[PDB]
Each structure stands twice: as structure tokens, then as C-alpha cells.
Amino acid sequence: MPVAPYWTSPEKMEKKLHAVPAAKTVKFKCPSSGTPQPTLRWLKNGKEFKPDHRIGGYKVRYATWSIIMDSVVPSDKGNYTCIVENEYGSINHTYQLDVVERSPHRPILQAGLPANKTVALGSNVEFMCKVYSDPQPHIQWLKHVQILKTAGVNTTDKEMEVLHLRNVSFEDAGEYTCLAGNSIGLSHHSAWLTVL
Amino acid sequence: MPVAPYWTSPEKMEKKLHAVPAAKTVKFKCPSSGTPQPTLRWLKNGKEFKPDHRIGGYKVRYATWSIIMDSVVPSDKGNYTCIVENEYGSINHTYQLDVVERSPHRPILQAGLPANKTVALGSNVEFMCKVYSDPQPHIQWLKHIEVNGSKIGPDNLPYVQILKTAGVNTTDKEMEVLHLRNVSFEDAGEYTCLAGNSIGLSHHSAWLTVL
Amino acid sequence: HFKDPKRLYCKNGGFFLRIHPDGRVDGVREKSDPHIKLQLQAEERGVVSIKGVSANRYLAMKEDGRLLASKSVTDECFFFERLESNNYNTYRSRKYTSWYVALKRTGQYKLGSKTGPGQKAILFLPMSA
Amino acid sequence: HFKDPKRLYCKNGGFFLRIHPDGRVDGVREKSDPHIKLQLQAEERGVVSIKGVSANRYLAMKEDGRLLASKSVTDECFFFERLESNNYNTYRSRKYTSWYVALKRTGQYKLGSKTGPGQKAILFLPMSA
Numbered sequence A: 001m002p003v004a005p006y007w008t009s010p011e012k013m014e015k016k017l018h019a020v021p022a023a024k025t026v027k028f029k030c031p032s033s034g035t036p037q038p039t040l041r042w043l044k045n046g047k048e049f050k051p052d053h054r055i056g057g058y059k060v061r062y063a064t065w066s067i068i069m070d071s072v073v074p075s076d077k078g079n080y081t082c083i084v085e086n087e088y089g090s091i092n093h094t095y096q097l098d099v100v101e102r103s104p105h106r107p108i109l110q111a112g113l114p115a116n117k118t119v120a121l122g123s124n125v126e127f128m129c130k131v132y133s134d135p136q137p138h139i140q141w142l143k144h145v146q147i148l149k150t151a152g153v154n155t156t157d158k159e160m161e162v163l164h165l166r167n168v169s170f171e172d173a174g175e176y177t178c179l180a181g182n183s184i185g186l187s188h189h190s191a192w193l194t195v196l
Numbered sequence B: 001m002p003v004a005p006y007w008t009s010p011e012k013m014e015k016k017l018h019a020v021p022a023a024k025t026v027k028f029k030c031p032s033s034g035t036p037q038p039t040l041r042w043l044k045n046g047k048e049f050k051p052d053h054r055i056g057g058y059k060v061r062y063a064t065w066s067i068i069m070d071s072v073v074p075s076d077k078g079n080y081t082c083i084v085e086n087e088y089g090s091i092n093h094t095y096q097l098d099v100v101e102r103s104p105h106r107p108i109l110q111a112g113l114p115a116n117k118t119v120a121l122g123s124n125v126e127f128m129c130k131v132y133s134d135p136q137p138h139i140q141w142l143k144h145i146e147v148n149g150s151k152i153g154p155d156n157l158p159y160v161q162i163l164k165t166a167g168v169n170t171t172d173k174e175m176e177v178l179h180l181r182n183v184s185f186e187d188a189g190e191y192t193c194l195a196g197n198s199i200g201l202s203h204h205s206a207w208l209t210v211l
Numbered sequence C, D: 001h002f003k004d005p006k007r008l009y010c011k012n013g014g015f016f017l018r019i020h021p022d023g024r025v026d027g028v029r030e031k032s033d034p035h036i037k038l039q040l041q042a043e044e045r046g047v048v049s050i051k052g053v054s055a056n057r058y059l060a061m062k063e064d065g066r067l068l069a070s071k072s073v074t075d076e077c078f079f080f081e082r083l084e085s086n087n088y089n090t091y092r093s094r095k096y097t098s099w100y101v102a103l104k105r106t107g108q109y110k111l112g113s114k115t116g117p118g119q120k121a122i123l124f125l126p127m128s129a
């Protein structure tokens, strides 16, 4: 009694995108059936996959129509397609794997910024601060202290990377600091404003 | 027809010690059977385990008599015991989990070492270098030379003299300390402790002042 | 980039946190959904507001522990963003300090009052956009 | 610490690399084994000798790809120690550059001539001692 391969557990195939942090073990399954019993094969980005194609390789448990990847890494990012097929038909599902590396550290400020600037009395000057940080960082501008700018709903990160000092005076002369910190630590870069 | 719980797949319980690097997903299983169907529970170091006991918690698949721990960390190091039991008996196996944190970076030298030292002519002096490195690091001691008032060679590299090199003939035991016996105005100068692994190179210098 | 929008992929089922223009909050697996682009802003070290870019609303958790997005900010739109040791993020309400933002494996949120440290619904993975 | 001995736990079955005093090389899962304490020494950046402390011999891979431990060092006792992207280590023979040190899931080594990048046999986890 011929029957083309078919998904036996279609619901456990709903999650097409698997985003995980590195090293996490990932397993994709294609529970299917059909007589005569269908064969199961996998494809990484359309091409033919093979155990030696990744460290530790892959493990295929036909018993559960699944493929397993131990300690996944950026190199594994891609599309994986399972192909269940017998003599009377074929079916296939495709999962998307995305591996995320997290940078759990205090914010990092672009070296060199802000930059010392010497300007004419009354001029206009703008200081810059390029911040990097996985967790949402909180930037704040200081004058040596006097808080001059602080990230938040009132002052979004859009405008926090640049401090504008309009029509300066001998008073505005001094050291400014860009302080940015997240829940892991604090980082800051200073800079000197020289007014003539 | 009563039957005490029993291991159905004893072979896949052979590996009692699971050593892995952090974050790796760990899964312990205790494939067993018995009628009436036995219950499955787990224990971390004898005490009762509970999902809120670890971030992300754990997942138990009775379907396969397994416990799963995603992204494991040092805090998870310990003994894990599964207890399968019904009314006519109980069985239990215990796995050992050990997590190793890896440091994939060029070696790191203890700040401050080696240390500048000013000494009397003829004295004895020893420089020190504390290195850290997951991958086996290769330490080497150098002395910076000047072939004239020139401390730099034509290729824009520094004239140096290898003084000590890690290896089978000079094991890491004695590599963290450089001994300069009975110094002379010649020995005066800058010494460098260079250590590097497959990821990068690190070095700390220091000045020897002889009077 | 901290300044670019992000999508919040919840570990529990792969649902992206979504803010509807009407204020409803739930999840969608579809990466192309027009309401999953969120602008996370820090109000201070470790504390953020989560703003649905398209809906132009803020994710806020009410006292009963239900989610929704206000048109204007309130003390209930602030959460402790924490990069857990498993590398997933957790958004714990700074107001009702024991509850997190979470999604059920069905694409609907989960009452903070029902959220907890060992749960998969609380884990989120920030993704560029 | 890089100066203290280490045990090399092979991902393939949890076997610790062991060097017998007579030169035989294989694996043992028993962490208390008296012959699994190894002294890894660097001969230079990324290259190490692996010496069984007890056996007082060096792990060397012969041309046919079989392992054994010499009483004295030879150009065949040097391997490229590499911390792979998945956090396990691989000891690739510097001489027969395409082969690795590995153990079968049965506790015996695996001929270098049969070792390869995608294999679990080559992955090792260094552990303190």
C-alpha cells in the first residue's frame, strides 16, 4: 500500500528560525512517515552536508528524523534543509540557524574621541563620542563636575554621540568627559577644550 | 504484572564524568522502565534540584528520562543524580559534571613585572615574569642590545640577545625568573619577557641600572 | 550598534517581541513583521525603555503583570536589562521588581506575575536591524 | 596554571589521554588513573611536546599514524596545540601535518591517518591537576 512521505508532527516544525548563542547544542527535526519508509538527508545552504564539514561534526538520528549540532559556532549560521523521500514522493522543510556572540563587557569608546580642540573665543565646537556595548549603554557628557547631557527618553542615543558647545567663552575652556556605562562597568574618555 | 524500575539502556550511562567548556549544553539521561511506570526526579549534589535553581533553569524530558542544561557554567559543577522509582523498587545513577572556562587570548603578563632594578656593580639580580594563558604559552627572555648608539637594526627591529627559551631543555618551572649573576656595566640595559601562544604575543620590559 | 534598532527574539518558541501600533504586545516568528523593530534606550546604567519604532509606543508592564505599550513614557516603561550568564537577555520590570517581560510558546505574552528566573519565556536574544 | 600538569579529556567518550610507563598510549575514563597527568610544554608559539609525568615519556606520532611515547624527545613529539572555535583543543602532529592525536570511543587511540577536522576523536579538553 504505497504512500508518499509525509510530516507526522507538522507542529514541531513551526519554528523555522533558530537563534542561539554560541556553543549551544542545536537539533533540527523533520518527523515524517510513509511507505515504503522514506530516507532522510540534510543540506546546509542547499549544498550536501557531511560530518567532517564542522568540528565535532553532525549526528543524524533517523530514529527521530533529526540532525544534531553540538557546540554551534558562527560558521554554522545558515539554512538547513531536510529531505524525506521514498519512491512515491518527497517533502522537505528548511530551518534557519543564527548564532549570536555576546560581548559581556563594559562599554568601549572609540580611541581618540572625544578630541582635544583649540578654538577662538566665541566659536562653536562639537565633541564626539563613539560607544560600543552589547547591553544598552548609558552615555553621559561631563564638564570638569557639571552634567551636560544624559541619555534617556528626553535625550535619545541619537544625539548623545555629539556634544555641542555654542559660542564658547574662556569659561567653557576646560576638560570634557564622555562617560558611558552599562551594568558590567564604566568607561570614559576625556578631552581638553582650549579657548583663545 | 509488577516490575521494579530498571535500566533499559545501561550502556549509555557508562560515561559518569562529563567535562565540558562553559556554555556547552549538557544532557544527562537515565533510560529506564518498569511497571507500574516509574517516576523520574533529579538531584544536584544530593539536594533537591529545581528549575529556578539556575539561569534558564533545566528541562526534564521524561519521554527519554533525561535532564537538560543549556549554557552550563562553573556554578553547575557538581553531582547530578537521577532517581527512577515505582512501588516495587528504586534505582539511581549519578553523573559528575565539570565545567572548564576557556581563555582564548594572547598571554597576559602580571603588570609590574619584570621590575626595573638598580644595583651595584658585581651584584646578583633576578627578574621575574608571571604569565597567564589558557593555551600553552611559550616564554622567552631577551636583552636589548645597541650595536652603536643604535638600538634599532636596519630592518627597524631591535637588536636583541636571546637569554632563555621555554622548552624541553628549559621547562616552564624556571622560565618565570631570569638570573643575572655578578653583573657588570655591560649587563646594564633593558630586558624583556616575551610570551606568546597561537593567538598573539605579549611582552613586558624592564631596565637594569648598574652603578 | 547600540544606536540602531533591534529585534528581540524570545528563546521560548522563537517569537520576536512585537509592539502593535494600537498598544497590543505579543510575539511573531516572522522576521519581516513591520512591528518588531524596537529602539532600546538606556535611562541609566542597566535600565532601559523599550520603544516599538513603528507603533511609536513604549513597552510597559502594569501592576497585574500584563504588557502593553503606552504612547508616552511612564515609570512602568523601565526595565533592568541583564545579559544573563547563558547569553540571553532578561527584561525585569524595575517597578514590579520580581517580574520579567516574556512570551508564551504560543506567541502571546506571559503575565509578569507568572514570570520566573528558571523560565524560558523570559530569555531574549537581541538582534540587529 | 600553565606550569602545573594537566589531564586531557577527549570529547569522544570522556577518555583521558593516558601514557603508560612502557610507552603504550590509550585512554582511561578513570580520573584517578596514575598515568593521565601530562606536562604540556611549549617548544615555541603554538607548538607543544606532551609528556606523561609518571611514564616519563613523550607522546609521539609515527609515520603510519600510530601513537606511542618515547623516552627521549624526537621531532615526532611536537604538535600544534590549537584552541578550536568550539572550545576544545586539537593536537595536530607538526611532522605529519594532517593528522591529529585522538582516541576512539573504545579507549584506544586512532591512527592519525584516520583522523580528520570534523571528528570528535580529535577534540580534547585540558583540565587542571
Ligand SMILES: O=C(O)C1=C[C@H](O)[C@@H](OS(=O)(=O)O)[C@H](O[C@H]2[C@H](O)[C@@H](NS(=O)(=O)O)[C@@H](O[C@H]3[C@H](O)[C@@H](OS(=O)(=O)O)[C@H](O[C@H]4[C@H](O)[C@@H](NS(=O)(=O)O)[C@@H](O[C@H]5[C@H](O)[C@@H](OS(=O)(=O)O)[C@H](O[C@H]6[C@H](O)[C@@H](NS(=O)(=O)O)[C@H](O[C@@H]7[C@H](O)[C@@H](OS(=O)(=O)O)[C@@H](O[C@H]8[C@H](O)[C@@H](NS(=O)(=O)O)[C@@H](O)O[C@@H]8COS(=O)(=O)O)O[C@H]7C(=O)O)O[C@@H]6COS(=O)(=O)O)O[C@H]5C(=O)O)O[C@@H]4COS(=O)(=O)O)O[C@H]3C(=O)O)O[C@@H]2COS(=O)(=O)O)O1
Pocket (backbone or CB within 6 Å): A025, A056, A057, A058, A059, A060, A061, A068, A070, A071, B011, B012, B015, B018, B025, B026, B027, D011, D012, D013, D103, D104, D105, D106, D110, D111, D114, D118, D119, D120, D121, D122
Ligand atoms: O539525541 C541525543 O540523545 C543526544 C544528542 C546530542 O549530540 C548530545 O546532547 S548534548 O547536550 O550533549 O549536546 C548527546 O550526545 C551523546 C549521545 O546521545 C550518546 N549516544 S547514545 O546513543 O549512546 O546515547 C553518545 O554518543 C556516542 C556514541 O558512540 C555514538 O552514538 S550512536 O548511538 O549513534 O552510536 C556516536 O558515535 C559517533 C562517533 O563518536 C564518531 N567518532 S569521530 O571521531 O569520527 O567523530 C563517528 O565514529 C565513526 C568512526 O569511524 C569510528 O569511531 S571512532 O571512535 O574511531 O571515532 C567508528 O568507526 C568504525 C567503523 O564504523 C567500522 N566500520 S563497519 O563496517 O564495521 O561498520 C570500522 O571497521 C572498518 C572495517 O571493517 C575494517 O576492517 S575489519 O577487519 O575490521 O573488518 C577496516 O577497513 C579497512 C581499512 O579502512 C583499510 N585502510 S584504508 O585507508 O586503505 O581504507 C585497510 O587497513 O584494510 C581494512 C580492512 O578492509 S575492509 O574491507 O574490511 O574494510 O577499518 C574500518 C573502516 O572504517 O573502514 O571500524 C571503525 C573504527 O575502527 S578504526 O580501525 O577506524 O580505528 O564508528 C564511526 C561511525 O561512523 O559510526 O561517528 C559515530 C556515529 O556517527 S553518528 O551518525 O551517530 O553521529 O557519538 C558518540 C559521541 O561520543 O558523541 O555520546 C554523545 C555525546 O554527548 S555526552 O553528553 O554524552 O558527552 O545526546
Ligand SMILES: O=C(O)C1=C[C@H](O)[C@@H](OS(=O)(=O)O)[C@H](O[C@H]2[C@H](O)[C@@H](NS(=O)(=O)O)[C@@H](O[C@H]3[C@H](O)[C@@H](OS(=O)(=O)O)[C@H](O[C@H]4[C@H](O)[C@@H](NS(=O)(=O)O)[C@@H](O[C@H]5[C@H](O)[C@@H](OS(=O)(=O)O)[C@H](O[C@H]6[C@H](O)[C@@H](NS(=O)(=O)O)[C@@H](O)O[C@@H]6COS(=O)(=O)O)O[C@H]5C(=O)O)O[C@@H]4COS(=O)(=O)O)O[C@H]3C(=O)O)O[C@@H]2COS(=O)(=O)O)O1
Pocket (backbone or CB within 6 Å): A012, A013, A018, A025, A026, A027, B025, B059, B060, B061, B064, B068, C011, C012, C013, C103, C104, C105, C106, C108, C110, C118, C119, C120, C121, C122
Ligand atoms: O527530544 C528531546 O528529548 C529534546 C531534548 C532537548 O531539550 C532539546 O534538544 S537540544 O539539544 O537541541 O537542546 C530538544 O528540545 C526541544 C523540544 O523537543 C521541542 N519540543 S517539540 O514539540 O517536540 O518540538 C521544543 O520544546 C519547547 C516547547 O515549547 C514545548 O515542547 S512540548 O513538546 O512540550 O510541546 C515545551 O514547553 C515548555 C515551556 O517552554 C516551558 N515554559 S517556561 O516559561 O520556561 O516555564 C513550560 O511552560 C509552562 C509555563 O508555566 C506556561 O507558560 S508558556 O509560555 O506556555 O511556557 C504554560 O502555562 C499553561 C498553564 O499551565 C495551563 N494551565 S493548566 O491546565 O492548569 O496546566 C493553561 O492555563 O495554559 C497555559 C499556557 O497555555 S498556551 O501555551 O496556550 O499559552 O505551560 C507550562 C507547562 O508546564 O506546560 O513547560 C513547557 C512544557 O515543558 S515539558 O514538560 O514538555 O518539558 O518545552 C520546550 C523547551 O524544551 O524549551 O524545543 C526544545 C528545544 O528548542 S530550543 O529552545 O533549544 O531552540 O529536544
